[PDB]
Paper text:
Tom1p is a large, 374 kDa member of a broadly conserved family of HUWE1 factors (also called Mule, Lasu, Ureb1, Arf-BP1, HectH9/E3^Histone^, Ptr1, Upl1, or Eel-1;). This family is characterized by a large N-terminal domain attached to a smaller C-terminal HECT domain (Homologous to E6-AP Carboxyl Terminus) that provides ubiquitin ligase activity ([Fig fig1]). Tom1p has been implicated in the turnover of excess levels of small, basic proteins including ribosomal components and histones. We determined cryo-EM structures of Tom1p to reveal a helical repeat solenoid architecture for the 2,888 residues preceding the C-terminal HECT domain and an overall architecture that resembles the published structures of HUWE1 but with a larger fraction of ordered residues.
HECT domains comprise two lobes, an N-terminal lobe and a smaller C-terminal lobe that houses the catalytic cysteine residue (C3235 in Tom1p). Multiple HECT domain crystal structures have indicated that the two lobes rotate with respect to each other through the catalytic cycle of binding E2, transthiolation of ubiquitin from E2 to the HECT domain cysteine, and subsequent ubiquitylation of substrate. The 379-residue HECT domain adopts similar structures and maintains the same intramolecular contacts in the open and closed solenoid structures of Tom1p and in the published structures of human and *Nematocida* HUWE1. Overlap of the Tom1p and human HUWE1 HECT domains shows a 1.1 Å RMSD over 256 pairs of Cα atoms. The HECT domains of Tom1p/HUWE1 family members are thought to ubquitylate substrates, likely for subsequent degradation by the proteasome, while more N-terminal sequences presumably function in substrate recognition.
Numbering used by the authors: 2850 to 2903, 2909 to 3261
Write the structure that this text describes.
């Protein structure tokens, strides 16, 4: 509870001094990666763009089909020709409308065209249908492996060109870009029913109630193919000792292994323009704010479309929460969104239509009841925040920021 008011003020002073004299860092760039858990996102964004500076490429595309045209126009350009060139985008017809602004909207329309179901590239995420995760059955488009490599190439090029993309993904996508491992809490936003299942397995005695094998059956492409999680998992019965390993092995396959090659291609196109050992300055929450951008959220429209369960409006904890939210900066407010709703994207119609797994799930603030010595938790499917009853406002603020940044 104590040291909470200090460690936040300490972090703000360190970053402020680095803004004043960025030469104070100097040295190897890898040291910034090693001590990222204290660096400001804007300072990270600064030193990132710094090391990123160490010709002209004419492209003409039809606005109706900017995805395939850009794909075919850059299909034979090498990585060096794409990493080191100024894209001069032209539209067949509608020519001479504007200058370099065409490139900014060239990225925007290209961002929406990626998720066209006609390509079978991405499937919508259940927590927020406006966010997408890769389609495990992307083999319907037989050239999909060249598409994910093309997509990661565009995402990385937009990062180099300081252009924001209206594309937001599930959290494990950014974690794969950074090489970070997935968690069971990632399964929440992608399949809350399976999450509730796996959580029950880890919480209850499964001696005779449930039984499984270390294998997964996928009725995919008219075949009952059974894949072994571990060697011989088709026959390894799940017990109580291997219970923790089963959930971990299951989550790994259901998330990363089931889309291993599409992600590998995606990373090949991405790492070809943004090296892994300098994109890893950012965590999975900051990486979304790099590509899409920091949102400008309306705390008023947020609190006006906020419900409270086992709490009340004008409560002591609720007063602490909003006095803390309004005391957060753009980075911490964005990560508070990402903590609860799972994304950094505010709905176009406002928080009054904040979507969830079942539909319009407005922002809920539940109550933890158990031990004020826990950090706040969240469920991205229902946009609810479990907030324990904290006595002091500063204990709430530090415990929020401790869950907001970390994870």
């Amino acid at each position: 509870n104590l040291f909470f008011p200090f460690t936040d003020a300490h972090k703000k002073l360190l970053n402020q001094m680095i803004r004043s004299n960025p030469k104070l860092m100097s040295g190897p760039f890898a040291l910034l990666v090693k001590n990222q858990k204290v660096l400001d996102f804007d300072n990270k964004r600064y030193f990132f763009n710094a090391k990123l500076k160490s010709p002209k490429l004419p492209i003409t595309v039809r606005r109706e089909q900017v995805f395939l045209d850009s794909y075919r126009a850059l299909f034979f350009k090498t990585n060096d020709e794409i990493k080191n060139s100024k894209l001069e985008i032209t539209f067949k017809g509608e020519s001479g409308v504007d200058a370099g602004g065409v490139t900014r909207e060239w990225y925007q329309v290209l961002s929406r065209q990626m998720f066209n179901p006609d390509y079978a590239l991405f499937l919508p995420v259940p927590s927020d249908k406006t966010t997408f995760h890769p389609n495990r059955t992307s083999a319907l488009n037989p050239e999909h492996l060249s598409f994910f490599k093309f997509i990661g190439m565009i995402i990385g090029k937009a990062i180099r060109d300081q252009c924001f993309l209206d594309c937001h993904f599930s959290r494990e996508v950014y974690k794969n870009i950074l090489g970070r491992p997935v968690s069971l809490k990632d399964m929440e936003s992608l399949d809350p029913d399976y999450y509730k299942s796996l959580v029950w397995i880890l919480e209850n005695d499964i001696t005779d109630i449930i039984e499984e094998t270390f294998s997964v059956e996928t009725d995919d492409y008219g075949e009952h193919k059974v894949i072994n999680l571990i060697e011989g998992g088709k026959d390894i019965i799940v017990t109580e000792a291997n219970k923790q390993d089963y959930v971990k092995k299951v989550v790994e396959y259901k998330l990363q292994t089931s889309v291993k090659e599409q992600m590998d291609n995606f990373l090949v196109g991405f790492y070809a323009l943004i090296s892994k050992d300098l994109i890893t300055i950012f965590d999975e929450q900051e990486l979304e704010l790099l590509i899409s951008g920091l949102p400008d959220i309306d705390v008023d429209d947020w609190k006006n479309n906020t419900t409270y369960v086992n709490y009340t409006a004008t409560c002591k904890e609720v007063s602490y929460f909003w006095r803390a939210v309004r005391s957060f900066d753009a980075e911490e407010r964005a990560k508070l969104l990402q903590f609860v709703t799972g994304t950094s994207k505010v709905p176009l119609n406002g928080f009054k239509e904040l979507s969830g797994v079942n539909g319009v799930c407005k922002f809920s603030i539940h109550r933890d009841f158990g031990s004020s010595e826990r950090l706040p938790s969240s469920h991205t499917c229902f946009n609810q925040l479990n907030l324990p009853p904290y006595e002091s406002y500063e204990t709430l603020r530090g415990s929020l920021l401790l869950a907001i940044n970390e994870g």
